[PDB]
Design a protein around this ligand. Structure first.
Ligand code: NA
Length: 461
């Protein structure tokens, strides 16, 4: 991805977009009960903690574009992945406006709390004033579609979240690209059935894990991965995607029956953005935040890995490449050992910056003991080995509980953490509950005991 130009929004006919400048994050009742080092990300150029230009840091993710066209290996990757998706019999029909708006089997309704994007965000008009979940009314929406059309600018927001000290000082805050409600609705109508098919089919056929339930899905994964596992991390995956990857994606879509609406992918690839009082144009780069983002990033990941394997290991048998992606995150396997370091090398030529799985310093062999997916390890249950525990380390959880974005959601926030933490074992879980209950706020929460979560887990399969 590469920013073509950037300039005052007024010069191109756009209003200044006002965005929050103060974080909603504040020390929670457990701030000093648990250890942590993360703080709220910088949200403005005038933040006292900044040790470098803010605007420069937040846009540096656009490292540029390394490839213009779709080469021989990419076409091969496209044919193989498309043929594989072909076996799911995905309904290629367009999804009606009502379902695209309020949901249907395999697709949740539109999130009524997130931004409505441009121009609504500039007219002070919110989603709540456009759709009614009880009515499933599509009259206002329709009227808005006809009035403002599609292919509207995306609104760039800084993500209000916890970041490390380094990332705070280096102004490395992440950005959200809120697309207009019109495009979101248009895209969910165009790809609604594709999204549904993926959500209902997490695994090695879609090569996607979006819409999955770790508690249940973890037990299915091992029986889907071949003998040798391999994985690696990406640096600025979304922003690094070159236009060629979007073209490769459209080819996949064409081959599976959606060639009818590949133009919507151009909207993602060559995108128009609004940030504060500036407007900019980007060539390449996936708009992190847009509807379908997760799925399209996952699809492109399936193309990338296949491409690097073809380029690096001619004669590789893609039919035995078993991988599951969730955006840039991936867990892959092959009957034979492969060199991630070599693949990483090939990756550079495709505009991808690949590094050792889980911040390792060197490319080490990935095993079932050290592999992670969505920050979770895999651990067989001591009593019933066929049941696999998704284990997220307590560090992440400790960092999160020390802050709050709304005192009214303390119960939900802490319960959420509990559903992640109990998998670390009973000894650990109880220590966690005890600390929570060492302060008044914690003692007033209704939290599930270990044996309760274990029983609930077994009863969920
Ligand atoms: Na883009």
């Amino acid at each position: 991805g590469e920013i073509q130009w950037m300039r005052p929004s007024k010069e191109v006919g756009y209003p200044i977009i006002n965005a929050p400048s103060k974080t909603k994050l504040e020390p929670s009742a457990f701030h000093y009960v648990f250890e942590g080092v993360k703080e709220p990300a910088v949200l403005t150029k005038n933040d006292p903690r900044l040790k470098t230009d803010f605007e420069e840091a937040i846009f540096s993710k656009y490292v540029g574009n390394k490839i213009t066209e779709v080469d021989e290996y990419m076409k091969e990757a496209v044919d193989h992945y498309a043929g594989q998706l072909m076996s799911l019999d995905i309904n290629t029909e367009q999804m009606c406006l009502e379902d695209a708006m309020y949901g249907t089997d395999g697709l949740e309704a539109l999130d009524l709390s997130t931004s409505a994007g441009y121009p609504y965000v500039a007219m002070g008009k919110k989603k709540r004033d456009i759709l009614n979940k009880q009515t499933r009314d599509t009259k206002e929406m329709q009227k808005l579609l006809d009035t403002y059309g599609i292919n509207l600018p995306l609104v760039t927001y800084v993500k209000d979240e916890l970041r490390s000290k380094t990332k705070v000082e280096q102004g490395k805050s992440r950005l959200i690209e809120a697309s207009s409600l019109n495009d979101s609705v248009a895209m969910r109508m165009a790809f609604g059935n594709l999204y549904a098919a993926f959500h209902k089919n997490p695994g090695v056929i879609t090569g996607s894990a979006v819409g999955c339930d770790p508690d249940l899905f973890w037990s299915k994964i091992p029986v889907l991965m071949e003998e040798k596992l391999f994985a690696f991390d990406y640096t600025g995956y979304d922003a690094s995607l070159s236009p060629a990857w979007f073209e490769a994606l459209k080819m996949v879509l064409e081959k599976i029956g959606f060639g009818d609406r590949v133009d919507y992918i151009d909207y993602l690839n060559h995108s128009h953005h609004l940030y504060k009082n500036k407007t900019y144009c980007v060539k390449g780069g996936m708009p992190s935040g847009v509807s379908g983002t997760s799925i399209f990033n996952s699809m492109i990941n399936n193309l990338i890995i296949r491409t690097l394997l073809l380029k690096t290991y001619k004669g590789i048998d893609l039919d035995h490449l078993k991988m599951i992606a969730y955006g840039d995150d991936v867990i892959a396997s092959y009957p034979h050992e492969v060199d991630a370091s070599l693949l990483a090398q090939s990756g550079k030529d495709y505009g991808l910056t690949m590094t050792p799985a889980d911040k390792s310093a060197t490319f080490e062999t990935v095993t079932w003991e050290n592999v992670t997916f969505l920050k979770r390890f895999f651990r067989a249950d001591e009593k019933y080995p066929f049941l696999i525990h998704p284990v997220m380390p307590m560090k992440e959880i400790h960092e999160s509980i020390r802050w709050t974005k709304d005192p009214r959601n303390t119960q939900d926030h802490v319960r959420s953490l509990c559903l992640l933490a109990w998998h670390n074992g009973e000894e650990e879980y109880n220590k966690f509950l005890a600390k929570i209950r060492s302060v008044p706020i914690g003692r007033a929460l209704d939290l599930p005991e270990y044996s309760t979560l274990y029983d609930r887990w077994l009863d969920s399969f």
